[PDB]
Amino acid sequence: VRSLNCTLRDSQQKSLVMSGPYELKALHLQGQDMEQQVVFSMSFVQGEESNDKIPVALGLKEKNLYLSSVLKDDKPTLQLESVDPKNYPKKKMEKRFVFNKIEINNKLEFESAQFPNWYISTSQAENMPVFLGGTKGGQDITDFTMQFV
C-alpha cells in the first residue's frame, strides 16, 4: 500500500510526542529536543476520495500502533491501537483506523471516516493529549502542517 513518512505539527507549532505507551501529547518543542517527536507512516487506503478528501491511515513509523476512532462512553475517542504486525498495513483498513485528510489552504485536517465531523484535535495548552474533537471553531486546534522525513 503506498505509505509516506511524516511528521505532524499543529497550527500553533506544537510537535507531537508519545505520552504513555498509547497516548500522543502535543507540546512546543525546539532544538535537539525535536528528536523526541513521533514520525507517522501515513497509508493510502481504500475509501471515499475527492481531490480535497484523501482517506489515510496513521501509523507510527516502525511500530504496530495505529490511530483509531472508537466509541468510549458514548463519545468518539482517539486511541493508539496495537495490531498484528504481519497483517498491517492494508489497502482495505478497517473503518476505525481511517481518516479523511482534507487540504484546506496549506493546512491539513483529519476527519474520522467513522465519526463524521470529528477531527484529530490538540489543546491550546502544553502537554495535553491529542483527542477526537467534534467542534471546529476557535477553541481546539484541528489543523496541521505536514513535513516529509
Curated annotation (Swiss-Prot):
MF GO annotations: cytokine activity; integrin binding; interleukin-1 receptor binding; protein domain specific binding
PTM remark: Activation of the IL1B precursor involves a CASP1-catalyzed proteolytic cleavage. Processing and secretion are temporarily associated.
Compartment(s): Cytoplasm, Cytosol; Secreted; Lysosome; Secreted, Extracellular exosome
Result for mutant: residue 63 to E: Suppression of integrin binding. Markedly reduced activity
Top-rank taxon: Eukaryota
GO BP annotations, alphabetical order: apoptotic process; astrocyte activation; cell-cell signaling; cellular response to interleukin-17; cellular response to lipopolysaccharide; cellular response to mechanical stimulus; cellular response to xenobiotic stimulus; cytokine-mediated signaling pathway
Regulation: (Microbial infection) Cleavage by S.pyogenes cysteine protease SpeB promotes its activation independently of CASP1. SpeB-mediated maturation of IL1B plays a dual role depending on infection site: while IL1B inflammatory response prevents bacterial growth during invasive skin infections, it promotes streptococcal infection of the nasopharynx by disrupting colonization resistance mediated by the microbiota.
Main subcellular location: cytoplasm
Short motif Involved in interaction with TMED10 C-terminus, span: 110-123
Keywords annotated in UniProt: Cytokine, Cytoplasm, Inflammatory response, Lysosome, Mitogen, Pyrogen, Secreted
Effect of residue 72 to E: Suppression of integrin binding. Markedly reduced activity. Markedly reduced activity
Tissues expressing the protein: Expressed in activated monocytes/macrophages (at protein level).
Site features described as Important for interaction with integrin, chain residue numbers: 53, 61, 63, 72, 86
Any single Gene Ontology cellular-component annotation: lysosome
Effect upon mutating residue 61 to E: Suppression of integrin binding. Markedly reduced activity
Keyword Secreted attributed: yes
Effect noted on mutating residue 23 to N: Requires 2 nucleotide substitutions
Record-marked site positions (Involved in receptor binding): 2
Induction, per UniProt: By LPS. Transcription and translation induced by M.tuberculosis and a number of different M.tuberculosis components in macrophages; EsxA is the most potent activator tested (at protein level). In pancreatic islets, release is increased by high glucose treatment. In pancreatic islets and macrophages, release is also increased by endocannabinoid anandamide/AEA.
Subunit structure, as described in the record: Monomer. In its precursor form, weakly interacts with full-length MEFV; the mature cytokine does not interact at all. Interacts with integrins ITGAV:ITGBV and ITGA5:ITGB1; integrin-binding is required for IL1B signaling. Interacts with cargo receptor TMED10; the interaction is direct and is required for the secretion of IL1B mature form. Interacts with HSP90AB1; the interaction facilitates cargo translocation into the ERGIC. Interacts with HSP90B1; the interaction facilitates cargo translocation into the ERGIC.
Role: Potent pro-inflammatory cytokine. Initially discovered as the major endogenous pyrogen, induces prostaglandin synthesis, neutrophil influx and activation, T-cell activation and cytokine production, B-cell activation and antibody production, and fibroblast proliferation and collagen production. Promotes Th17 differentiation of T-cells. Synergizes with IL12/interleukin-12 to induce IFNG synthesis from T-helper 1 (Th1) cells. Plays a role in angiogenesis by inducing VEGF production synergistically with TNF and IL6.
Other information: The IL1B production occurs in 2 steps, each being controlled by different stimuli. First, inflammatory signals, such as LPS, stimulate the synthesis and promote the accumulation of cytosolic stores of pro-IL1B (priming). Then additional signals are required for inflammasome assembly, leading to CASP1 activation, pro-IL1B processing and eventually secretion of the active cytokine. IL1B processing and secretion are temporarily associated.
Family: Belongs to the IL-1 family.
Protein name, as recorded: Interleukin-1 beta
Native organism: Homo sapiens
Upper lineage: Eukaryota, Metazoa, Chordata, Craniata, Vertebrata
Gene transcribed to yield this protein: IL1B
Boundaries of the shown chain within the full protein: 119 to 267 of 269
